[PDB]
Design a protein around this ligand. Structure first.
Ligand SMILES: [Ca+2]
Ligand SMILES: [Ca+2]
Length: 1203
RNA sequence: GGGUCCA
RNA sequence: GUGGACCCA
């Protein structure tokens, strides 16, 4: 100690200056009050001056209204908590009134008039707070809306009332328009932007006034959008602001909007990789049951809470044991996850979103400065969110030469807490240092441990899920013949023993029952423990008195509620939520555990618009009861999509349309478009004409046209469309053609596998002279395969990958194709495969019944081209259960050769690269699946594998033609693994071609028989393929064009030239709407038409029912409606702030489901899943329902979004 | 149930 | 109307 401390808190409470910054300045005035302060005044600017080194990208915005002179101010700081402070408001409420009266529209004027208080402030706070900008709006009737404090707008109108300026101020806050009229545009900005585009599209070789009308149309919609005028009114997006305005009378001279910290770089901040770099700079010189406790550090930005967080880890490592960005560490007794609370809003989001709640906070203030004036906003954050327990660490105590002075800081931080109803008298407060503790100084290393001591004692052990009252969200209800009623779900809390009493509460009059049983797919047990996906048996309750969403809990544990208060976070745009604010009416659906449910909300006191990105307390009244108590998380669901998330805060008490319009559309949908002859052919031909190309003159050409592989990308795109568009059309009369050609083709693939099964058995040329590229490739192939695949199929994979999913089996048919029909009806099963079925049966109590026991499968003919059908095979369904088994273990393995079979997307970018680069080729094989002979599979696969594969295979075929085949091919499509098997066989083969050439095997990528690989291999690969069976289609394999195709995408020199197809005769408005959308998609570039096609589109649009010509949807919403603008759509019944648009569905009649098969299918899936801002967790998978498709259409209303 | 998609 | 992807109702 040096100077008396008692009258230092006097020197301080008069300023707000830091303790030690206030004591060492009283140690140079001899104990002089009014002098010690003056040393500080003229020294506090040496502080605020070394503040330019702190980015100030947070802050607030303000607006004042003097009859009709208005001013908008944006002074920013660098933290959430400061901008919502007591004193920071005071400075900007002040500096906003120096703008009103003394009308200032220069920024430098007040940035100096105040330049004192600004520095006398930061000394008080400690964050770089500069006034950032100001400007005023000169106009007649002007209004100003402010959205919280984050954003403020300024509107100067003319002829509009008290509402009309608020409202168009509210749109401005939402839609941030750069200009006011579609004409307020730098002739240059739109002169460069027209000349930048007028080449772009001329590049592809579009003709002048085509690229021109196209360019122009774009920079029409461009300026339309950025300009207030041509922006859909946000409170009625049917009409623009242009129309909103004029329609009334008025006109706005102009507007202003600032948003806090706009265009402020703000270099990013991590945490884990942040601490690890404070740790490492000094980090050099069984019992899994332990509870998991989340904590968060929350203090002043530079009271070094990043330093205290490091020590907690280097010193808890140096002692005891060993979502995104969150350091964790261990105690002998507990396991801790440590978050940082660097923003108030930001944290609240992560509390609601669920992506990091808190079991105890820890407040980090430095004794050098004591509590910061904004420290109340920290304790406040905790109070609001309700972090139950707050511990305090006093940092940098070494740097204090009087202990009496610490007793004085504690006193402060101890009272501040209790002002916010935190136990501030009995609240643990440690004195220590973080820097020192890193330096290896145990005198201070102890205080870190001490802190850890308090996490282990003060913060209470969070009640293990297992220990709370029983509760299982009902997912689906079955009526099982002689097992009564049964529900399936994941028991979320507690435990249920057989025999116990349960309530089924939720949507109707909370009912009760008693538990008859508990069972999984394998084990049937007598208790369901938390976290387990089970099925619960009930008695004395028909399965029609239970719905999904309902729960099932220990009686009185939980109760059905309708009205509650909450806090929700609304998903921003860039997180795929709304992109349009809502207001008073909002009427979304609330997803609870397992089902949506509708409700109205009521914004709190004084809000009236909400945007994507805002947290918000709101009050929610549901359509009907859900079982709920405080803490229950529920997502906000806007027909299909999640737009918001939110948690129940307090459970309160308990308090458009068009039928003969859907009727009109329904009637039309079911109408039948009708014309003379080949409507499809006609569209194709008029299209060719509209692009300047000789139309087809006979149906014979449509499927016999050869494209030219040169020409600008535009002379080609059409040529290619011309060649491919009609190719797949099943309706061509002109053909001596049949599906007998499909069989003949089938019969050849066999003659093929014949030769190659013999060829591949006889590698004894004569002597040892000559060597075959073929022979060696299968030799290299073999080894790669075996090192990748393994000895033989694990069971770990085998069982976790076997499933039913599909359609027709040998004993089921398309109608009974759904997996639950494979569980209900006994399934055939080849002899060789019987053991696996038994093995399955041997590991489950449920009857696994095998019907027939034959080696036979059914070959059939699905329509395809108009020149050939497709041959397929329907496998014995118990075979197919396991074929999908291994097919999925293969798919999974195949990912280490970087082949990823659920993403033809990677196989189609390389499609496109190879098309500019000309180094990758794309290969096409003809009948692939039909050519993979047994000989080949054996030679390449482990014998281990080649057996399971032999087992699971169907070996003989039975045809429609009554007869029989013994398969030469190891397998054909239809089989549950034939597709990965080709992938594997093909990839391996190709990589071995690569290795033989010093080529990089990384360059082989494969999907089915869509092979991509370095262009120089192709001739080797070709020669290999010829040898081992496969027959390579030169016409469609491209190792040198400007053109490559792969996985449905086609490219010419980087330009997308993928066409569209008219497969069937066009006859429904449904059918035609389709073609018109494929035409639309193929000739639009961001809603802007190529003139030449827009013509042919427009023409044919007229063939549809009037109502249906104007009923339009956005893209990515299917083909139940013409894609166009959904704001022009006159049927777009907006309803509760969310646009519902009607679309044509395929009308279906509901059908009886197989309760047991549906129920096994249910349990077998929960099994399957166990042995194998992001918040989708709150969204399960659907109850099995069945429906026969009828030939009629229906109209379904669905939810859409403006863009 | 719908559409692309490799067979 | 088998088998796979993927967006969609
Ligand atoms: Ca092919
Ligand atoms: Ca291909």
């Amino acid at each position: 100690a040096e100077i008396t401390a008692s009258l230092v808190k006097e020197l301080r409470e008069r300023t707000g200056a830091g303790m030690m910054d206030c004591k060492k300045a009283l140690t140079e005035a001899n104990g002089d009050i009014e002098l010690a302060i003056e040393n500080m005044r003229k020294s506090g600017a040496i502080k605020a001056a070394k503040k330019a080194g702190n980015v100030a990208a947070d802050g607030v915005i303000k607006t004042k209204i003097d009859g009709n002179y208005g001013i908008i101010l944006e002074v920013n700081c660098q933290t959430d908590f400061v901008a919502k402070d007591a004193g920071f408001q005071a400075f900007a409420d002040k500096v906003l009134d120096a703008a009103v009266a003394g009308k200032i529209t220069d920024v430098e004027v007040l940035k100096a008039q105040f330049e004192e208080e600004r520095v006398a402030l930061v000394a008080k706070i400690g964050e770089n707070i500069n006034i950032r900008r100001v400007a005023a709006l000169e106009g007649d009737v002007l209004g100003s809306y402010q959205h919280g404090a984050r954003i403020g707008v300024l509107v100067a109108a003319k002829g509009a009332d008290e509402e009309l300026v608020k409202h168009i101020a509210m749109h401005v806050a939402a839609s941030k328009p750069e200009f006011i009229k579609p004409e307020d545009v730098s002739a240059e900005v739109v002169e460069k932007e027209y000349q930048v585009q007028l080449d772009i599209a001329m590049q592809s070789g579009k003709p002048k006034e085509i690229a021109e009308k196209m360019v122009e149309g774009r920079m029409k919609k461009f300026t339309g959008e950025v300009s207030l005028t041509g922006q859909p009114f946000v409170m009625e997006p049917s009409k623009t602001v242009g129309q909103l305005l004029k329609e009334h009378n008025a006109e706005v001279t102009g507007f202003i909007r600032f948003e806090v910290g706009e265009g402020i770089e703000k270099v990013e901040t991590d945490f884990a990789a942040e601490v690890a770099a404070m740790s490492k700079q000094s980090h050099m010189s069984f019992e899994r049951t332990k509870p998991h406790v989340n904590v968060g550090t929350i203090g002043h930005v530079d009271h070094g809470k990043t330093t205290l967080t490091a020590a907690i880890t280097t010193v808890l490592a140096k002692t005891y044991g060993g979502n995104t960005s969150h350091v964790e560490y261990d105690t002998p007794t507990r396991h801790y996850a440590h978050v940082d609370c660097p923003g108030h809003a930001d944290y609240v989001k992560n509390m609601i979103t669920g992506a990091a709640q808190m079991d105890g906070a820890i407040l980090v203030v430095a004794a050098t400065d004591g509590p910061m004036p904004q420290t109340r906003e920290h304790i406040l954050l905790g109070r609001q969110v309700g972090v139950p327990y707050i511990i305090v660490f006093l940092n940098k105590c070494d740097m204090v030469d009087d202990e009496e002075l610490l007793e004085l800081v504690e006193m402060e931080v101890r009272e501040l807490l209790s002002q916010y109803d935190f136990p501030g008298d009995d609240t643990p407060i440690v004195r220590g240092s973080a820097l020192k503790a890193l330096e290896g100084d145990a005198e201070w290393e102890a205080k870190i441990l001490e802190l850890a001591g308090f996490l282990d004692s003060y913060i209470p052990e969070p009640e293990r899920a297992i220990d709370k009252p029983f509760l299982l969200p009902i997912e689906d209800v079955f009526s099982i013949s002689g097992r009564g009623t049964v529900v399936t779900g994941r028991v979320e809390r507690g435990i249920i023993k057989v025999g116990e009493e349960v309530e089924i509460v939720g949507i109707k009059e909370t009912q009760k029952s008693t538990c008859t049983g508990v069972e999984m797919f394998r084990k049937l047990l007598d208790e369901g423990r938390a976290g387990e996906n089970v099925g619960v048996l009930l008695r004395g309750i028909k399965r029609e008195e239970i719905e999904r969403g309902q729960v099932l809990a220990k009686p009185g544990t939980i109760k059905p509620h309708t009205k509650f208060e909450s806090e929700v976070y609304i998903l921003s745009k860039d997180e795929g939520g709304r992109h349009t604010p809502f207001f008073k009416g909002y009427r979304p659906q609330f997803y609870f555990r397992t089902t949506d449910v509708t409700g109205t909300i009521e914004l709190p006191e004084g809000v009236e618009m909400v945007m994507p990105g805002d947290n918000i307390k709101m009050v929610v009244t549901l359509i009907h009861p859900i079982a709920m108590d405080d803490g229950l998380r529920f997502a906000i669901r806007e027909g299909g999509r999640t737009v918001g998330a939110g948690v129940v805060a307090k459970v309160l008490s308990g308090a458009s349309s068009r039928n003969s319009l859907s009727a009109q559309l329904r009637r039309a949908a079911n109408t039948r478009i009708e014309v003379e002859g080949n409507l499809a052919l006609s569209i194709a031909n008029d299209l060719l004409l509209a692009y300047g190309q000789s139309p087809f003159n006979s149906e014979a050409e449509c499927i016999s046209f050869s494209p030219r592989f040169d020409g600008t990308p535009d002379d080609f795109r059409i040529n290619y469309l011309k060649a491919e568009i009609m190719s797949k059309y099943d309706d061509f009369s002109l053909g001596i053609d049949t599906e007998a050609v499909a069989w003949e083709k089938f019969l050849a693939a066999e003659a093929e596998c014949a030769l190659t099964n013999a060829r591949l058995y006889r590698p004894d040329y004569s002597e040892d002279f000559n060597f075959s590229l073929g022979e060696s490739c299968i030799h290299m192939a073999r080894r790669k395969i075996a090192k990748l695949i393994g000895d033989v199929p694990s069971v770990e994979g085998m069982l976790r990958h076997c499933r039913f999913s599909g359609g027709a089996t040998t004993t089921n048919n398309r109608s009974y194709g759904h997996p639950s029909f494979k569980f209900a009806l006994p399934q055939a099963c080849t002899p060789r495969a019987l053991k696996y079925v038994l093995a399955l049966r041997a590991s489950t109590h449920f009857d696994i019944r095998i019907s027939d026991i034959s080696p036979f499968n059914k070959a059939v003919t699905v329509p395809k081209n108009s020149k050939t059908d497709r041959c397929i095979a329907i496998e014995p369904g118990w075979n197919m259960f396991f074929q999908l088994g291994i097919g999925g273990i293969l798919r999974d393995r195949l990912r280490c050769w970087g082949i990823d079979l659920n993403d033809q997307t990677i196989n189609q970018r390389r499609a496109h690269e190879g098309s500019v680069t000309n180094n990758l080729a794309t290969v096409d094989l003809s009948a692939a699946s039909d050519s993979i002979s047994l000989a080949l599979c054996e030679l390449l696969l482990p014998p281990g594998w080649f057996e399971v594969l032999m087992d699971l295979r169907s070996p003989k075929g039975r045809l429609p033609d009554g007869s029989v085949v013994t398969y030469e091919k190891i397998s054909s499509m239809g089989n549950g693994y034939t597709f990965e098997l080709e992938s594997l066989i093909f990839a391996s083969l190709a990589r071995s071609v690569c290795e033989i050439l010093d080529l990089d095997s990384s360059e082989v990528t494969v999907y089915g028989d869509d092979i991509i690989l370095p262009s120089c291999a192709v001739p080797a690969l070709r020669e290999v393929f010829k040898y081992v069976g496969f027959t390579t289609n030169t016409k469609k394999t491209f190792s040198e064009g400007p053109f490559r195709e792969s996985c449905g995408k086609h490219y010419y020199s980087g330009v997308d030239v993928t066409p569209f197809y008219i497969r069937h005769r066009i006859v429904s408005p449904a059918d035609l709407i389709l073609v018109l959308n494929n035409l639309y998609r193929w000739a639009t570039i961001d809603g802007v038409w190529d003139p030449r096609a827009h013509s042919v589109y427009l023409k044919y649009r007229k063939l549809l029912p009037k109502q249906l010509q104007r009923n339009t949807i956005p893209d990515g919403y299917g083909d139940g409606a013409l894609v166009g603008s959904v704001l022009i759509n006159p049927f777009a019944k907006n309803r509760g702030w969310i646009r519902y648009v009607p679309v044509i569905t395929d009308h279906t009649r509901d059908r009886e489901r197989a309760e047991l098969g549906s129920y096994l299918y249910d349990l077998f899936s929960r099994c399957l899943s166990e042995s194998n801002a992001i918040d989708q967790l709150i969204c399960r998978s659907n109850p099995t329902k069945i429906s026969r498709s009828t030939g009629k259409f229906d109209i379904q209303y669905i939810a859409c979004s403006s863009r």
